Amino acid sequence: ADYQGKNVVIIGLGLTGLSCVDFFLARGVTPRVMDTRMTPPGLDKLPEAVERHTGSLNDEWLMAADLIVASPGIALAHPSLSAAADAGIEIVGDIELFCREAQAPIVAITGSNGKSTVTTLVGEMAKAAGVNVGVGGNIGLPALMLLDDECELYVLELSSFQLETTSSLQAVAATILNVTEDHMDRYPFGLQQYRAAKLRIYENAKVCVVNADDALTMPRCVSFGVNMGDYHLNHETWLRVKGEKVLNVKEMKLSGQHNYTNALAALALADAAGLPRASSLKALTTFTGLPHRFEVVLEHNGVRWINDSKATNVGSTEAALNGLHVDGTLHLLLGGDGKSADFSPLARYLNGDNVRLYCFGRDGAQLAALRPEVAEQTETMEQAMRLLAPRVQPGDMVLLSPACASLDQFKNFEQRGNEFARLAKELGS
Template sequence: MHNTSFDTQYQDKAVAVIGFGVTGQACVKFMLARGANVTLFDSKYDDLLDKQIDDPLLVQVKLARFDESSEFEGFHLVLVSPGVNTQKNAIQRAIKLGLPLVSDIELFARHNTTPTIGITGSNGKSTVVDMLNTGLSKEGLKVAVGGNFGNSVLELLDEQYDVIVLELSSFQLELTFSLKLSVAAILNVSEDHIDRHGDLLSYARAKQGIYKHADVCIFNRDDVLTAIPPEALPESKSQGVDDSRSQRLFSFGKTAPLACSQAVELAIFENAEGLYINNAKILKYEAIAHLAKHNVLNLQVALLCAKAILKDDNAFKKCTMSLMTYRGLAHRFSLVRQTTLANGMQTQWINDSKATNPGAAIAAINCINENDNLVLLVGGDSKGTDLSELKSLISSRVNLLLSMGKDARRFAGCCANTEFVASMESAVNAAKQYVETCTTNSVVLLSPACASMDMFKNYQHRGEVFEQAVNAQEFS
């Protein structure tokens, strides 16, 4: 059990910050501004030492090497960046000493007074956050987004907002204990980051921590791992949960809600006539017919969040209509190019580089017309996830599989027509050669189901390289 008790007066207190990425830098700035004595621990100690004299931030801190021998005894607080594995021996020793180890999100939680929405899940988080930013901003609210998307959460404390929307990862949530949310939502839970969390249930439990201090909890009724655990419900007094609030439950999903589900106050669902909240139609089917299946679910969550935040029915209706023009984020099932062969056959080239786990790739494949030839580009670092469900879908839906990167061979045997390629350019060339032989329409889909850092800077870089390779092709 982690110690989560610490004094929020930091003047002259010894504070350790582990990691100097975006999160670590924000933590250092936050603590220095409040008079703390900061020691920065980083595995790139030698590089930072060389830069220290010229860096206005680094010159104000003490530098220390972060490795298995690092010691944290005597620190008032240890701030851990999300990329740092808490299973490392040095971190575990700090926990045994009873030191408070927290995320930047927990630090934000201790100082935030603005109504906040938290979104987590294996897939779709960024899209829902962006949808909410779009819809709520058009209603005249001053909206800030942060966490795993946009700005560091600590930077959001410096200005006044009407609402803050956070994308929260399992890494951030596992060291967050007192985040009070106006709305908390888990979109889905599928195999991801198993190399870090150990198993699917531990990963799910990290996600479920988002509900603990939320006023409104939104879960996916088709995904049991998004359910609110008993200890997060207000009536569980024995768990020490703040039960002075009345927690409201909303649900979304592909299936219709059960009529007997009395505990759920609002349920959103789709049928052949449109989108409904309980018995009230909020959108005609024609208004959502253009959306990919997974984006209909993302829209459901965004609308439930807006319903919880916007008390005025007219404001909610305007927000709903504004989301009908939402066009999505880059690298998330985005059309790069549509090409036409001399025989009239068309090929769509789709960049879904953000699909860094099997669940995301499965969602993307299920959006493709079953009558189209499907060329799928996969591979990278699979993070120890179970690929069996994805492999089964590939075997039934994919006409050509192009696999690359560190774990390329993990995809062997799941498609009769498989090629292992050394680069994105080689993959795009192979895809082009294949679709030029097809006598029906085709889709070339980059949906890797893996992380990107084995070959690229990040998923954005991977998507950009794909788009460049596609746009460089000449078609007859």
């Protein structure tokens, strides 16, 4: 696309907003940026020649623009963006800009849970194939920063928000791993609207990879599943493709059924992208996992401290608990911005005499209510931890898998995960 002479407005700073700014400057276009936050991240890294309006949106800027580039963090339903859409002003995201430029095939991955793992695995599978691959998007580097014509493959994680402003994506392989309640604060029309956003990822996709165990992930598409699907499991556990064994999961550093289904999805995607299977399977044996994604940060004195800060929704926390083995007592930490999510689904995993809940952040109270007889409620996570540490016995597990966003008290789930690791080392000895 050609943006010359166009009046461009970017909504939202941070790394993404900056990646968008650099995108236009390099192309000889000076955009204006606005952020509803008084001091958005990156503000000081923004070139002085770039006009900025913070602390709110500027409708005079918005209605005068030829192109509005909206951060996934602002809803198209916002009246200001809504008025501009009515006026016929074109609105896009960074992912849209990226798609219009990319000169390599794109593997697009989305889903309520497992997208970063799968996106990282496909990245890993391309590296083992000797493919110059750009991995990023909703994780790692913002898509616009991955743009290089020497790049031979792009692997992008895409959120429902990003997909909402994208229309030019023609993925060589795309998937929705699953759809479970999340982001309801941004989807006033319920689960189906949320799903509708994710389904956009299949539009123009050369191959669609669906989850045979989750009907919501379906728009033929190649499928993956536990007991069924083109890519499925076999029980010792094996990853099978159309009846043929391809990998005994004991060769994987990752465990858990959902991580095995992740392996199948990554494989299905890698295959569709033409990546050599041998090297893709090798990558499945070398990947160790993502930080904050069910990460043991300390295992000392018979006690495991696991950092699953990346569990920012009920489905995710549920994955950590379903089948979880604990010798003694599970001290589970929940809390933050639950985003109006129904927490009930967790309750069935919260019975027995070996559970303790330590609920904090904005929705702490609501989280304690799952089983008030075994729950404590503090304001912060550090209080929750200094509260549980004394009660930790050999055989116990301290699990931070909050089922919520951390944006209410933290910059991001990584900050919350890192604070948990520091505290655990402190109290774990």
